[PDB]
């Protein structure tokens, strides 16, 4: 699957940044896992991840610093507690988990600059 996310996003003074992650085509699924990853010099580390279903469209409830609502084939993501040093490349990974077939796609990454 194709995954679209913005090239560049400016975080707030409060350390908050929002950006959408959208995939296509909108294959049948009942379980979508969205993982946010940070690229750090060869290593990809997990920032936060959740699983969206038809009844649970509001995700990352178990994270203080990550929020996300899912609709159509689009997650609107919000990362909090960003610092200047947290400037970097944030990749949206999308997985269609059930039922078969499995699909996986990886966004190009959103560069996040922190004011």
């Amino acid at each position, epitope marked *: 699957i194709q995954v679209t996310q913005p090239s560049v996003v400016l975080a707030s003074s409060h350390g908050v940044a929002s950006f959408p992650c959208e995939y296509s*085509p909108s294959h*049948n699924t009942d379980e979508v896992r969205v993982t946010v990853l940070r690229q750090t010099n060869d290593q990809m580390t997990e920032v936060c991840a959740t699983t969206f279903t038809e009844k649970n469209t509001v995700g990352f409830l178990d994270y203080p610093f990550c929020s996300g609502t899912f609709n159509e084939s689009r997650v609107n993501l919000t990362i909090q507690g960003l610092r200047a040093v947290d400037t970097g490349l944030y990749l949206c990974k999308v997985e269609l988990m059930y*039922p078969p077939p499995y699909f996986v796609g990886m966004g190009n990454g959103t560069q996040i600059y922190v004011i």
Partner: nanobody
Amino acid sequence: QVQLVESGGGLAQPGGSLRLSCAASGSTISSVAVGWYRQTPGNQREWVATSSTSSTTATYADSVKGRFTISRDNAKNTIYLQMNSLKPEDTAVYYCKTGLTNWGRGTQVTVS
């Protein structure tokens, strides 16, 4: 955005066949995996099968594997579920779906 319309439902005898249709309007489903689900009285909609895509083959639940077949008709922007060797327990309302929540209106299938 895609509106899905089921048809072909009705009554069949045990051992009989029905061909269900999921016709899409709005945009094309030529490239979208389309799922089929069935709902018995008092239960949740349950996955039955998903159509092929450019990169994947059709998939089936083991309860219908070998009896049911999904085929495409791009020109009619439609997916077909061929239902052979029907059983009374195949009785249900059948829905097609794309994405997470884009359900059709469902069509009743009754096997005596």
